[PDB]
User: Fold Allene oxide synthase-lipoxygenase protein from Plexaura homomalla.
Amino acid sequence: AIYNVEVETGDREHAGTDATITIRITGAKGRTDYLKLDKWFHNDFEAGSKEQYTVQGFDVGDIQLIELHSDGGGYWDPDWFVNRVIIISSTQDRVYSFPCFRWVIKDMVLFPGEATLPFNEVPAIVSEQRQKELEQRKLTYQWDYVSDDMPGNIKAKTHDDLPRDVQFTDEKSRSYQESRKAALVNLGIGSLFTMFENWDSYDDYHILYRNWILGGTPNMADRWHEDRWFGYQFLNGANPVILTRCDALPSNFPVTNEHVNASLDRNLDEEIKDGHIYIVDFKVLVGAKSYADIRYCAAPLALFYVNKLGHLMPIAIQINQEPGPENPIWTPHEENEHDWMMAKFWLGVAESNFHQLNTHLLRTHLTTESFALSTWRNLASAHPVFKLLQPHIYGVLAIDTIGRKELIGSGGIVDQSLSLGGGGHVTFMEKCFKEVNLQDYHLPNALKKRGVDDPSKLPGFYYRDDGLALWEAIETFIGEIIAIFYKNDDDVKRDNEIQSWIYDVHKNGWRVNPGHQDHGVPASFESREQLKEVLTSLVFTFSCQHAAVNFSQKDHYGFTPNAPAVLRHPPPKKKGEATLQSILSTLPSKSQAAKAIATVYILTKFSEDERYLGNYSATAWEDKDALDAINRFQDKLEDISKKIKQRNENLEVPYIYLLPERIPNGTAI
Ligand SMILES: [Ca+2]
Ligand SMILES: [Ca+2]
Ligand SMILES: [Ca+2]
Ligand SMILES: [Fe+2]
Assistant:
């Protein structure tokens, strides 16, 4: 009898309703009857309201769960986004919290505070009510596949076709669209599009980014031409992947001491084997270019060497896999300057497509999408991990939906930007995926398994430093939570839910279809340290990974000559033919280069309603310990944030892509 119901409404556009809301409290001695919550001569549940409704009914025992019920809205978006509900029984000395943060269509059952594992002590009704929702989730979130060689994704024709809980905030859409090719016009590039001519000089390209006032001028926009900075980027550029330490030269990359020598402080075979030689091998390329707009791309491999002064230097570039008089080994000593510059460019077009399609779209978006769908399908609003993932899985589902049309679809801004845009990009994506493995998403392992792990040999690798820093915090945090709710490795095995989660991804997420090699995803969890491992990788990829590989694009591609996406001619068959003209009639044309900035501009736009790593402002989480763990976590993030800046306050080109307050909680683009 007599309950105080504090009903805070989210501030999301539309978060409010004008539907007749009634609540039904249920508990020990029983349940009441839907009580109308509504202040007179007052507009209840608006914009981002927070109201205290006093109502009176049967005396439900200890309140075991509540039920909010709406009704089509009012005459003059009856979808209500409830943030939280906090009721108080005038007969119970507790303060029932009911974190929600979801849209309330017709109904919405909410369990009290503390997050629980499906097996924890739950009154009969609170389960069956939980198992209840799960049957519903596996109904409004079902798999669909585009092909046998792509991770499964959420079924939904259009963005607005998928569940409102996963849809883009009006702001995300507004930001998306405004930023869309609408923002192409504000860049002052519009004309270049209808311009299929060449450029007069490297420096000419510079225009494409003048009216892109934000973020500032691209880093490499004034050092791109320099070998030293050309190498720098393989460590701190947008593709911090690929580069692996070279223990021995690949049999088809006949680099000899008689090739490099010149660029060696301190021998070659001695250098290799002394940890001062790293290599990049784009063998995965072999796709279809073009889209007479004829495009090109290679599958080269380059050799780098760490200077007497820690600079990773480009010493050898074989444009294509099969060595030969036709695919020569280009050195930074090519007596014909242009020929070496042309080599680097080719290495560039390759990286560009490799990076955009593979290490960004597939490896951060598309693949981890599966996990996020598994999250809604298998974990319940109550499960600790659902509450842990929620703030990180947002935006993938939405942006990927949009993306399959707008991004990688035909005539999509990407499609008509890379040299694999004809559709070769779709097939190439499949190749890359047939080889993705969950063990790749583990930064520490990955880094280490590449021989890129050591500071003394490979100095100046901030992606690594900054990455590991964040990973160790993310890992730490995730850990403690698992601890809180998972008392031991048995609770893990016991958790039927987390078992279904990781399994949905195993058998339907990254399907190990024919060609594919095992995708390294478990089929169940055996320990806590393992659950921790997967979870950490997953969130680190949703946040840190994505940011360091995507948001670094304005700088990277900023001045297209620094990272060409398309090449209009075949690669040098002989040597010494490269002309400023030639290598300028090969680089992306005026409109092509315009299509780049355009794509990149849209790809790298933060919305106003963004939340970063720390932020959990709109998460369930009631348990005191968790909250602490969180703040503990946020405290480490701060440190990293400071320490990182000190680092930058001290180097020629500051690595700011992994700064906590720039790393979105998830992947929304
Ligand atoms: Ca509404
Ligand atoms: Ca209202
Ligand atoms: Ca009213
Ligand atoms: Fe993205």
